[PDB]
Every structure is written in structure tokens, then in C-alpha cells.
Design a protein around this ligand. Structure first.
Ligand code: PTY
Ligand code: PTY
Ligand code: PTY
Ligand code: PTY
Ligand code: CLR
Ligand code: CLR
Ligand code: CLR
Ligand code: CLR
Ligand code: CLR
Ligand code: CLR
Ligand code: CLR
Ligand code: CLR
Ligand code: NAG
Ligand code: NAG
Ligand code: NAG
Ligand code: NAG
Lengths: 344, 344, 344, 344
């Protein structure tokens, strides 16, 4: 039913499932905006496919040819099925709009499924190629941040009663390499191109005259070519073509609204803001150097992933509340850190 | 529905399920490229089979023979079913394209299922014959790497405050044996041959005239042979043949795009690059000798499997970050290793 | 659907499920070749049964008798159902090929299910009679091997810083008894005989003229015997008989390919090779005596089961890597064993 | 589908499910032969019921009466349904074989279900009445055996470096009481009687002329009794009667093969062999007295249950391997027991 389709595709965790494995425990591995874009671009065409053939919206068979009254039920059924299979056969049918509109009307669900698969492909390539590496690197970075926070609080407590910036060096090294950012931009660009092509196709499909679904059909090949009792042609109409056009314009609207989001996603350096690591600069055990901005490198992408999935880090949360309290400046950062006692 | 089939076969973990057993905990046991190739080559023909008979794309019955108006519904049904069963019986039907096109049109789903099964067979043979051995060997290798890393860090800590290369000897011994690599190449080659045969068949099927689905049928055997009221022949058409041809060309395109991937897979030594063990050479407890390249031996395959599923090793990750930091050369490898404190 | 059947029967763990109980944790209890043979011989006929009546391959009802035009729909339905039930009644129908072909055409699914059940019976008898005993014995043997390995490594460590061969005596005693091997050979032989009988039946079924599905039917018993308006006979055809013959020849090919595998399985002593226990002979705590070969006794079967499910034993894996390293001979077996430190 | 029914009823754990409760952890509570007999006798008739009405074997409706051509579809449907309901009404129909064959043809599924339920009743009575008691007693016996084995090995170890036979006294007391064995024999005898009655019924059903399914039907009661346009009688045939007879003879064959098994089961004392407790007689802490044989008492049944579910006992397994080694006599039983070190 329509409501069942809605529950499956919008109100359920459709493509929102976290990786089912212990390797990525709590790691999104995909930005929220990218996940939203993929979920829409994939589950919208599927939802429209399901809707267009819902038991309520669908009168019945997808084509009716209006055989003569003399024709029996199965003769008329032969006519309808023959014309359905003959939309491909150009000789059989003669339609003013041509045969491409008939092909599109017959295979619209296939085309929507193709667009959905093509849009799901780049996210899958990301999740299967560049996701494990970033997952491991980000897990190491979070562990290093937790360890340095613990060491700093232990030092502060000892004072009240190595020291090498490994994480900073690793981030600096990531500043050079760009394979991950190149893959990310390539997959986003392919998604954008697929969306644009889908928009072109949907606009063309919705621009039809709405009468191209009606085509003339001739069961006059073979032994029936010279038969007399059979009329030379029939009036066939492809039902649900109006529904297809409505859903196609809906998908076109959604995709044109979505494309600016993908374009904004492509410009990762601009998105790289609100320095996540700036909060850690007040730790004595952490060097006061952010050095993450203004670069078409994997460093900006790692900064984005950190700003996305750093809320799970207790040390980061503690430092964030310390920073927020520092806005008033009533107290002192080391005193607040010592009082917090948030090692684990 | 179409969307349900898509969710099952592309958006779900179809053939992507990890081995459901404690023996292989986190071990892929199959390269990512090989898994992708198998998943496509298997779940594409199944998806096309499901699509070709979807409740929306399917007008109804798969053949209609256009019985005379005088014929009753069940007489016409007898005609249609008789011709459906008589596509095999050459005498009954007379078609310009022959009888092989009719056989193919009737049994296209069976042929796609056969290709899917034949393509799934070599992966299954691998997973049931050569997977347990490589799993055990690779688990031992990872355990040995973890143990040697722990011993090296313990030695470094003791200095700050046996020694036999068992793993290196085991890898060197693997350099000689080649049964695993021979099995891998044989299964990949069989997959490639099956893909090529499927491409040949799909090209032949799509090259049909598109009118071979229309065949002349004669229910004139037995007591009806000399009956007069029955016409000497009927005009039967195999519905969904156009859909079969469309999906067959789609599968042909996918398989021709996939075959280069399989050929590239066959050349494992070329794939053997980015030495995974090179990072471990900086450990005092590990001998400085990689000795893994340029060989049609199981050593290259083991190197590939390591480069695939070594990200799960904390010691390997730590050594990798140490290597990446060494690019700048600001610090020292032993000092960084001591500061890391990543025993477990 | 066809794809659903494929997923259930070939791509899923159909009859590949491990024993659902804590008694056999990780124990196959069935050789890989035997499991493959049983899985094929059982799930192939079931798959063919499901395929032959798939919603796509099936035109509709399994028999159509072509009642006269004057006959109403339910009169024709009576004719068809009567002939379907009268394939058994020899007097009612008169077919050139006889009545056995009609019986076979009607009950082919039943015959395939019968063959599947008969082929599944010997494996079930094995798993319910001789599996618990071998499971317990093999678990004891693995525990003894682990314990002796632990004792030997402890002795080596003590030197660096009872002694009775219970397992060897148990294996020697198993050398005498042969009930398990006799049961194994009997079940394999029964499976082979069932496969041969199935091949005979399928060859006979596929050798039919292909026109035996068309039989003459007479609803002329009872009050209708002397009725005039009803024709003396009808032309009935059993639909799906061609599909049955195709699937029967497929099953015949599979079974003839499989029978050599079963024959090879029957010769267990030849299969008994690559001595698993030879690796343990280098342990000081283990006597240097294999004494397992060239016998129609349960010892060979136990050797096969060990070679099958010994990879799960850490001590065996360690000894195997020690053996492989010994190929070069660079080091020493006791030194390598001491350095391994693989007690648990 | 047929394959689905097979998977449910033969290839699945149909009635093979262990008690879903912590009270019986690993205790069969039912002998293997009895479980096999019950599973067959119950799931065979159910499987045949499902098969006889499978979507493939079933042409359609279960009765067709061949109404005149003048009759409309729903008039013919009224005729068919009336005759279906009138098989009971003797006046309406006049059949040569009588009315009992028609009753049986109509209610064969009900009769098979009745036999299945009646055969499942005694096993259920056992499992709900006499199973908890034997479970508790056998769990106590196994615990006592484990404790005495532990005490004996501890004594042997102490020597190398109460004593009352509670279990033997309990078994001796069980030698007197016979309520459990009486219940077991009664349930087995009732199962045998039900099987014999089912065989009688199936033989009678299969001995029919095969034409009793065709009966004459008269819709001539009420206002239609003196109606003229309606014929005085119709020719009705009960479809699937041949399938019923085939499946009934199959069930008859299975049950006649099974009855000897039940008779052999009834003679429990003969089955009481291969003394399970004989292995424990070599323990110093266990008295050398078996005293379990030649009795129509619960002791023999307890011996059977022990021989069935004693493999799960580590002490029993250890003593069994000691016994098997004693066949050669090379070593000594106490020395082997001390060396085993199998307390837990
Ligand atoms: C994806 C969207 C593809 C839509 C655009 C396809 C490009 C078609 C260009 C060729 C057109 C062509 O040959 O001309 C028409 C015939 O088209 C044809 O006969 C070819 C029809 C094109 C194929 C449409 C079917 C798409 C199936 C998608 C399946 C995906 C499934 C994946 C799981 C003639 O007619 P006219 O009107 O152009 O001219 C008639 C008067 N001059
Ligand atoms: C797999 C793909 C197999 C496709 C290629 C099959 C090779 C056929 C070669 C024999 C052809 C032959 O005997 O000649 C034709 C009859 O074919 C026949 O009657 C034989 C038809 C071949 C079988 C096709 C059915 C495939 C079923 C697959 C089932 C798999 C299920 C597994 C679960 C005659 O006609 P013509 O047109 O050639 O000449 C007519 C004018 N000279
Ligand atoms: C299993 C495979 C069994 C196939 C072989 C059966 C042996 C039949 C031998 C007897 C044949 C016989 O009596 O002669 C035919 C009648 O057969 C009959 O009327 C008997 C038909 C044999 C039974 C076939 C039905 C199998 C049902 C399997 C159900 C399994 C379900 C288990 C869950 C006459 O005709 P003709 O052509 O021989 O001669 C006609 C011109 N002389
Ligand atoms: C269980 C198997 C039961 C089968 C044996 C039943 C014994 C019947 C004895 C009475 C027979 C009787 O009264 O005579 C027939 C009428 O039967 C009748 O009208 C009575 C028919 C017997 C009932 C059959 C229906 C079984 C329903 C089982 C339901 C179980 C469901 C449980 C969940 C007359 O005809 P004729 O041919 O004997 O003589 C006709 C020429 N003298
Ligand atoms: C997904 C991508 C490939 C879709 C591409 C656009 C498709 C949907 C449409 C939009 C405009 C269309 C074209 C418009 C006009 C013509 C001229 C005609 O004489 C032949 C077909 C041809 C050349 C059409 C082919 C299909 C077309 C290119
Ligand atoms: C992503 C955004 C830009 C998509 C907006 C939809 C645009 C591309 C659509 C809307 C209307 C469409 C046009 C409608 C009609 C025709 C006439 C036909 O003979 C050729 C294609 C052509 C000229 C279409 C080309 C594509 C089109 C201009
Ligand atoms: C999967 C593999 C086996 C498929 C092999 C190719 C199949 C699909 C096709 C492609 C070309 C075909 C052949 C083309 C021409 C002829 C000549 C004709 O007089 C008999 C059939 C025969 C000999 C065909 C047999 C089937 C064929 C070989
Ligand atoms: C894997 C790649 C190479 C597959 C590409 C598809 C090729 C092999 C296909 C496409 C068109 C096909 C041809 C189309 C028509 C015919 C004529 C027929 O009488 C014999 C087969 C023959 C000659 C086919 C042979 C196979 C063919 C050449
Ligand atoms: C599974 C086993 C039992 C199958 C045995 C073979 C079956 C399928 C077939 C193969 C050959 C067949 C026989 C061939 C010829 C004849 C002669 C005829 O006048 C009576 C039937 C009889 C005697 C057939 C009986 C059934 C038969 C034996
Ligand atoms: C396991 C292997 C050997 C099976 C190979 C199939 C063999 C046994 C098949 C293939 C063709 C079959 C024959 C085909 C036709 C007939 C004629 C009939 O009147 C009697 C049976 C007989 C003679 C069949 C006997 C069995 C047969 C020879
Ligand atoms: C499950 C048990 C109760 C089944 C008992 C046997 C049933 C199936 C059958 C087998 C033989 C049958 C009897 C055979 C002959 C006659 C004589 C007739 O004039 C009245 C019915 C009567 C008396 C039948 C009654 C039903 C009967 C007893
Ligand atoms: C468990 C074993 C013994 C069952 C074997 C089936 C036996 C009991 C079957 C097979 C054929 C049957 C007979 C077939 C025909 C008739 C004639 C009828 O007027 C009375 C019942 C009677 C006489 C049946 C009695 C039961 C019968 C003898
Ligand atoms: C139909 O009849 C016409 C008459 O002109 C003839 O040309 C043509 O070949 C016939 N077609 C068939 C299929 O027999
Ligand atoms: C049909 O009638 C023809 C007349 O020539 C005859 O040859 C043939 O045998 C008959 N067929 C049947 C099946 O009776
Ligand atoms: C049908 O009529 C014939 C005429 O010869 C007669 O012999 C036969 O008994 C009748 N059959 C029935 C069932 O009344
Ligand atoms: C039918 O008509 C007959 C004429 O003899 C009469 O006896 C009978 O009562 C009538 N039945 C009904 C139900 O009116």
C-alpha cells in the first residue's frame, strides 16, 4: 500500500543503516549532507516507481487497445499484449510522437531504477574503497586525542597535588596527500552529473504532449497480414503515463533542489570551518597549532569528518564546555579542567 | 515490486555477507574487487530475471495466439498453452527465424539463472576449499605481527627505563608453494570464460530480428489433425521478448565492462604493490627483509590479502602512522614508537 | 520468483547449516565433498521442481483438452480436470506412448521430491547415528593434542630456564574397529545407487517422443457414456512436459558428473593421505609413530575428519608453520617452538 | 510449493526441536528411534496432505459435475458445490461403490490429519508426564557420576603425590518401580495400534475401484424437484482421488516398514545391551556391580536413556577411551586415568 511504501522509504532507516560490523562502532563514515543527498536521490525514484503502480492509483493493466466488439476476450488480450511488445517494433505501430515516447512510457520504471542504481554506485564505491582508511585514521586520531587529554589532566592533577605531537604530525602529513579528497570530489561530481542527466530525461519525459501514450497498433504481420476480419489497426493507450509524468516532474523538482546541495558539497574547503581542533589548543600537552584550512587536500575532508563525528568524544565535549565557559572568562581553563575530572 | 527487487539485489548485502562463523572474525577472505565482480555477475542476471516479469512491466501471459472469434476462452487458452509447450516440438510450429530463437525466448530466465549459478560456482569453490587455509595462515601472521610489535615496544620501554623471524620464514616458505595462487587463477579464468560465453549468448539473443518472437503454431496433431472447424494455423507471439533483449544487452554491456576487471585480477603479481610489510622493517625485533614481489606464487596472493585486511591490525596502523610522520623526518622512529604506547 | 528460488537453494546456506547445538561447536561432522554431494543431489531436484512451475515459465494450467466451442467454460474445465484425474484410469484415455508416460508427466515433481528425500536419508542417518560418536572422539583427540602440545612447550620452557601416549593408543584401538567406516561406506553406496536409479529414470523420461504428453481423453463413463452431444474423445496435452524433460536432462547431467565423486569418496583409504599427525612427531612429549594408512577401518575415516577439521587447532597450526619453516632448515624445531609461545 | 513443503517437513527440524527450556539442557528425553518413528508417522501424512493440493499437481477445483451447455457458469458452480455438500446426503447421489468412498474421498485430508494427531498424542503425553521425572533422575545420575569420577581422580592424584554408592543404590531402587516403563510401553503400543489402523484404512482406500470418485448427483430436492429444464442427474467426478490413492499407498508402505521398528522398540529389555555402566567399574570409588539387565522394569529404560545421552559426559568419555585402550592392555587403568587429568 501507499502508506507501507512511505514507511519503508521515508519513515524507516532506508540506506540510513550504520555499518553492520564492529570495525566502525559509532563512526558515520559519511557526512550528514552526503547521506541525505544519497538517500533522497536513491529512495525517491524507487518510491515513485512503487507509487505509480500502487493498487489504488492503478486502474489495472498498463495498456488497452479497444478491440472490436466481435473480438473475444482473449483476442483483445492478444491485441493488447501484442501492442505492448510491439512498442519496440517500429513497423507495427504508427504514432505521431514517434516510438521513443512509447519506449519511455513502457520502461519508465526501468529508467528510474537505473538512475537510482547509478546514484547509489558512487556512495557504495566510497564506502567500499575510501571508507575503511578514513575510519582507521579517524579512530586513531580520536584515541590519540583521548590519550593526550588523559595525560594532560593527569599532569595537572599531579601538579596540584615523549610529549611528542604525534597527532599533529599525522594531520600535517595528511595535508600533503589528496587521494581521499580526489575520490570524494570524483564521486560527488559523478553523482551531480547523474542527477543532471536524470533532470534532462525527466524534463523531456514531462514535456511530452500527453497524447503520445495513445498509439496506433497493427497486428498485421505473419498469417494475419492479409486477414480480412481483423481491422487494419487499433487504438491503444498506455495507462499510467500521466502518473509517470507527474512523478517525473516531482523527481525533477527534487533533483534540481538537490543539485545545489551537491555543488556546495563539492567545495569542501569552504565547508572546512569552525575549527574542531582549536578547542584542544588550551591543553599543555597539545601543541598550539591548528594548521588546517585553505587546501584541496585530504586534511580538509578529515576536518569535516572530525567536525561530524567528534561529538562522541568525551574529552572533546569537556574541552568544548571549557571553551564555552571561557567566553565569560570568570574562571581559568586549567582550574576548570582539573575540577571537571573527566578522564573517562 | 521493482523497488523491492532493487533493495534486495543492489541496496542490500546480497552476497556481501561476511562468513557467519567465529572462525573468520573480521577476515574478508575475498578481495574487494573479486567480491564486486562476483556480486555483479551473479545479482545482475537475477535482477534482470526479476525485472522482466515484474507486475508492472508484464502485461500478462507470456504468449498469445489470437484464436478465432468462434473459439471459446478455454479453446484459446488451449491454443496458447499448446504453442507454449510446442516451441520445443519443431513439427508443430513453422517460424522463419527457426526454433532456436523460440527456445531462447521461452527459457531466457533459465539461461540467466544458469549463468548466475556458473559464475557463483568458482567463488563458492574458493570459499569452501582455499579460504580456510588462507584464513588460518593470515590469522597466524597477524598474531605474529602483533606479538613482535608488542615485544619490540616492550624492549624499547625497558631500554628507556629467541628473536627468530618466524613470520619471515613462513612467508619465505609460502614463496615456494603455489597451490593457492593456482586455484585463484583457475577460478578467475573460469569466471572470465563463463562471462565471455554469456556475452556471446547475449549478443546472439539481442541480434535477433525482434520478429522471431512471432511464430506460426498448428494444433493439428492427433484427432484434431483432420478436423475442419479448427484453422490450419495460428499467429502466436512471445510477449516480453523485447524486454528480454533489452535486459540481455544491458547484461552484455555490464559483462564486457567487467571482463577487463577479471583480466586485471588474473595478473596478481602486478597487483602486488605498496609493500604492506615495508612498514614493519623499522622494528628492531623484525628483520629488515621484505622479499615479496615478482612471482607467480602464493606469496603475492598473501601480500594482496594482507594489503586488503591488515587495516584491522592496531600494530600495523601504528607503524603506518609512524611511517607517514617519517616523511617529514622531524622526529625519530623509535622515539615515536615509545611515545605511542599502543601495545593493545 | 526464479531469483528467489536461486537465492534459497544455491546462494543460501541450504543444508549447509552447522549443527545448531553446543555439543558440536565448530565441528563439521561431515566432509566437504560429502556435504557438497548431498547439497547438490538434494537441492537440485527441488530447484528444478520450483523452476518448472515458476510464475514466468508456466503459461497456466498443466493440461488443456480443447473442448468444442459449444462447450461452456466449466464444461471444458470438467473435461480438463477429468482427464487430469484419468491419466491413471487406463480405460478413459488411449495414448500411443501408453499410460506410464502420462503418469510420469503428471507426477514428475513427486518423483524428484522422492529422489531428493531418498538422497537426504543417508546423510540424516549418518548425522543422527554415527555423528555424535565421531564428534565426541574427535573432540577428545583435539583436546589431547592441545594438552600434549602445552605440556611439551612447558617442558621446553622449563629446560630453557605419566608421559603416556593416550591419544596414540586410542587411535591404534580405532584401527581395529570398523563400524563407523562400514556405516559411512554403506550410506555412500546407497547414495550412489539412488543417484544411478535417478539417472536411469531421468534418461527414460527425457527419451520420450515429446508427443506422449498429448493423449486422447474420453469422458464417456457413467450417464455420459451414451450421451450424444458430447464428442467421443478430446485432444488433451500435458503442458510443461518439455520443461520437465529439459530439467530432467539437466539433473541427469549433474548426477552423472556427481557419481564419480561418490565413487571416489567410497575409496576412503586412497583419500587418506597427507598425514595430519606427521607434524606432531617432532614434539618430545609425543611418540614418533603415525601408524595410520592402508586400512578399511575407522582409522582412515578419523584421519580424513582430522585433516578436514584440524585447522581450528592452534597447536596444529603452530606445528604446521614449524614444519613449513623446517623445509629450509635454517633454524631448529625446538627453538622455533619455544620462540612461538603459542600455549593458548 | 512442493520444495517448500519438503524443506519444512523433511529437511527442517520438524518435531526435532529440543525442549525450549533451561530444565533440559542437552537432554534428548526421547530415544533416537522413537523420535524418528514419531517424526515419520506425523510429518508423512502432513506432507502428503500438502502435496495432494500443491499448486502444480492440482488442476483446480476438487469436483466437476459437467452441467449442460445451456447452464450458466454459476448454475454449474451451484451444481458442483451442491454435489460436494451432498456426498454426505445419500438420497441426492447414487454411486455404484456407495457413499463411504465419497466420504473418504472428500475427507481424506481430515483423516490423515486425524492419524497424525493421534500418533503425536502419545509422544506428547510422554513428554508432558514421564519426561520431567526421567530428566531430573538422569541429571542427578550424571552429576553423581561426574562427582565420583572427580573424587576417584583426586584420590589417585593424592596417592601418587562417606564413599557410599548412592548412584548404585538409586539404580537398584529403580529396578523395582516400573511406572515409567509401563507408560513407555503403553504409549508405544498405542502408537503401533494407531499405525495398524491407519494401514488398514489406507489399504481400503487404495483398494477402491478408482471409479468410485465418479458419482451421479441429483439437484432435485425442494422447488427444483419437479423442475423440467434441469436434468434429472449429473456426472460428477472427485478430482485428486488418484493422487489421494497414490499418497495413501505411499503412507501404507512407510507405516508397514515402520511398524517392525515400533515392535522392536516395545521389547526394551532386548535393546538393553552394551552396558554403559560397565566402563565405570574400574574406578576405585565406584563399586564393581552393574546389576542392570533382564527386567521389565524402569531400570532397562534408564539404561537405554543413559546409553543414548551419556556421550555428553566428559568422565564417561574418558572412561570409555581408557576401556578402549585396555583392549591392548599395554598400560594400566589407574595410570592412564591419572595421566588423563580430565576432572573438568
Ligand atoms: C536512460 C534513458 C535513455 C533515453 C534516451 C535514449 C536515446 C535514444 C536515441 C535513439 C533514438 C532512435 O533510435 O530513434 C527512435 C527509436 O528509438 C529507439 O527505438 C530506441 C529507444 C531508446 C531506449 C529506451 C529504453 C530505455 C531502457 C532502460 C533500461 C534500464 C534498466 C536498467 C536496470 C525513433 O523514434 P523517434 O521518436 O526518436 O523518431 C521517430 C520519427 N523521427
Ligand atoms: C545455455 C545457452 C544454450 C544456447 C545454445 C544451445 C546450442 C543449440 C545447438 C543445437 C541447435 C539445433 O539443434 O537446431 C535447432 C533446434 O534446437 C533445439 O531444439 C535445441 C535448443 C537448445 C536448447 C535451448 C534451451 C536452453 C535451456 C537452458 C536451461 C538451463 C537451466 C539450468 C538451471 C533448429 O533450429 P535453428 O534455428 O537452429 O535451425 C532451423 C533452421 N535450420
Ligand atoms: C519412482 C519412479 C517410478 C517409475 C517406474 C514405475 C514402474 C512401473 C511399472 C508398471 C507399469 C505398468 O503397470 O504398466 C503401465 C501402467 O503403469 C501404471 O499404471 C503404473 C505407473 C507407475 C507409477 C508412477 C507414479 C510415480 C509416483 C511417485 C510418487 C512419489 C511421492 C513420494 C513423496 C501400462 O502402460 P505402459 O506404457 O507401461 O504400457 C502400455 C502398453 N503396453
Ligand atoms: C477415520 C476413518 C473412518 C473411516 C471408517 C468409518 C466407518 C463407517 C461405518 C459406517 C458406514 C455407513 O453408515 O454406511 C455407509 C454410509 O457411511 C456414512 O455415511 C458414514 C461415513 C463415515 C465417516 C467418514 C468421514 C471421516 C471424517 C474424519 C474427520 C476427522 C477430522 C479430525 C480433525 C453407506 O455406504 P456404503 O458404501 O458403506 O454402503 C452403501 C451400500 N450398502
Ligand atoms: C540519461 C541521458 C543519456 C538522457 C539524454 C537525453 C534524452 C532523455 C533525450 C532528450 C532529447 C532527446 C533527443 C531530442 C531529439 C532527437 C531528434 C530525433 O530525430 C532523434 C532523437 C533525438 C536525438 C532525441 C534522443 C533522446 C534525447 C537526447
Ligand atoms: C537540470 C535542469 C537544467 C533541467 C531542466 C529541464 C530542461 C533541460 C528541459 C525542460 C524542457 C525540455 C525540452 C522540451 C522539449 C524539447 C523539444 C525536443 O524536440 C528536443 C528536446 C527539448 C528541447 C527539451 C530539452 C530539455 C528541456 C529544455
Ligand atoms: C554458453 C555458450 C555455450 C553459448 C554458445 C553460443 C550460442 C548462444 C549460439 C551463438 C551462435 C549459434 C550458432 C549460429 C549458427 C548455427 C547454424 C545452424 O544451422 C545451427 C545452429 C548454429 C550452429 C547456432 C548454434 C547456437 C550458437 C552457437
Ligand atoms: C565478449 C564480446 C566479444 C561479445 C560481443 C558480442 C559478439 C560476439 C556478438 C554480437 C553480434 C553477434 C553475431 C550476430 C549475428 C550472427 C549471425 C548468425 O547466423 C551467427 C552468429 C552471429 C555471427 C553472431 C555471433 C556473435 C556476435 C558477433
Ligand atoms: C527408480 C527406479 C525404480 C526406476 C526404474 C526404471 C524406470 C524409470 C523405467 C525404465 C525402463 C522402464 C521399462 C521399459 C519397458 C517396459 C515394458 C512394458 O511392457 C512394461 C513397462 C516396462 C517394464 C518399463 C517399466 C518402467 C521402467 C523400468
Ligand atoms: C547412469 C547412466 C548410465 C545413465 C544413462 C542413461 C541411460 C541408462 C538411458 C538413456 C536412454 C535410455 C533408453 C531410452 C529408450 C529405451 C526404450 C524403452 O523401450 C526401454 C528403455 C530404454 C532402452 C532406455 C533405457 C535407459 C537409457 C539407456
Ligand atoms: C481407523 C479405523 C477405525 C478404520 C477401520 C476400517 C475402515 C477404514 C473400513 C475397512 C473395511 C470397512 C467395512 C467393509 C464392509 C462393510 C460392509 C458394508 O455393508 C457397511 C460398511 C462396512 C462395515 C465397512 C465399514 C468401514 C471399514 C471397517
Ligand atoms: C498392517 C497391514 C497388515 C495392512 C495391509 C492392508 C490390508 C489390511 C488391506 C489391503 C486390501 C484390503 C481389502 C481390500 C478389499 C476389501 C473388500 C471389502 O468389501 C472389505 C474390506 C477388504 C477385504 C479390504 C480389507 C483390508 C485389506 C486386506
Ligand atoms: C497474404 O496475401 C497477399 C495477397 O496479396 C500475399 O501477397 C501475401 O504473401 C500473403 N501473406 C501470407 C503471410 O501468406
Ligand atoms: C484424419 O483423416 C485423414 C483423412 O485423410 C486420415 O488420413 C487420418 O488418418 C485421420 N487422422 C486421425 C487421427 O484419425
Ligand atoms: C446407455 O445407452 C446404452 C444403449 O445401448 C445402454 O446399453 C447403456 O446401458 C446406457 N448407459 C447408461 C449408463 O444408462
Ligand atoms: C412438484 O410437482 C409434483 C407434481 O407431481 C408435486 O407432487 C410436488 O409436491 C411438487 N413439489 C414442490 C416442491 O412443490
Amino acid at each position: 500500500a501507499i502508506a507501507q511504501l512511505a514507511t519503508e522509504y521515508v519513515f524507516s532507516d532506508f540506506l540510513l543503516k550504520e555499518p553492520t560490523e564492529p570495525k566502525f562502532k559509532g563512526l558515520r563514515l559519511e557526512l550528514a549532507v552526503d547521506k541525505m543527498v544519497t538517500c533522497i536521490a536513491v529512495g525517491l525514484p524507487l518510491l515513485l516507481i512503487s507509487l505509480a503502480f500502487a493498487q489504488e492509483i492503478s486502474i489495472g493493466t498498463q495498456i488497452s487497445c479497444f478491440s472490436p466488439s466481435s473480438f473475444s476476450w482473449r483476442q483483445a488480450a492478444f491485441v493488447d499484449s501484442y501492442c505492448w511488445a510491439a512498442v519496440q517494433q517500429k513497423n507495427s505501430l504508427q504514432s505521431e510522437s514517434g516510438n521513443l515516447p512509447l519506449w519511455l512510457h513502457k520502461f519508465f520504471p526501468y529508467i528510474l531504477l537505473l538512475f537510482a542504481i547509478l546514484l547509489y554506485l558512487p556512495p557504495l564505491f566510497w564506502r567500499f574503497a575510501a571508507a575503511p582508511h578514513i575510519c582507521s585514521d579517524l579512530k586513531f586520531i580520536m584515541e590519540e586525542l583521548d590519550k593526550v587529554y588523559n595525560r594532560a589532566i593527569k599532569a595537572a592533577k599531579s601538579a596540584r597535588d615523549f610529549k611528542y605531537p604525534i597527532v599533529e604530525q599525522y594531520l600535517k602529513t595528511k595535508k600533503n596527500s589528496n587521494n581521499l579528497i580526489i575520490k570524494y570530489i570524483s564521486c560527488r561530481l559523478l553523482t551531480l552529473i547523474i542527477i543532471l542527466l536524470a533532470c534532462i530525461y525527466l524534463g523531456y519525459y514531462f514535456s511530452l504532449s500527453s497524447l503520445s501514450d495513445e498509439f496506433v497498433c497493427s497486428i498485421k504481420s505473419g498469417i494475419l497480414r492479409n486477414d480480412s476480419t481483423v481491422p487494419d489497426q487499433f487504438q491503444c493507450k498506455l495507462i499510467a503515463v500521466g502518473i509517470f509524468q507527474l512523478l517525473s516532474v516531482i523527481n525533477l523538482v527534487v533533483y534540481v533542489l538537490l543539485a545545489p546541495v551537491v555543488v556546495y558539497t563539492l567545495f569542501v574547503p569552504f565547508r572546512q570551518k569552525t575549527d574542531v581542533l582549536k578547542v584542544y589548543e588550551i591543553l599543555p600537552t597539545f601543541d598550539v597549532l591548528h594548521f588546517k584550512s585553505e587546501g584541496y587536500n585530504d586534511l580538509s575532508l578529515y576536518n569535516l569528518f572530525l567536525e561530524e563525528n567528534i561529538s562522541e568524544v568525551k574529552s572533546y565535549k569537556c574541552l568544548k564546555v571549557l571553551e564555552n565557559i571561557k567566553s565569560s572568562g570568570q574562571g581559568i581553563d586549567p582550574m576548570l579542567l582539573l575540577t571537571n575530572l573527566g578522564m573517562i
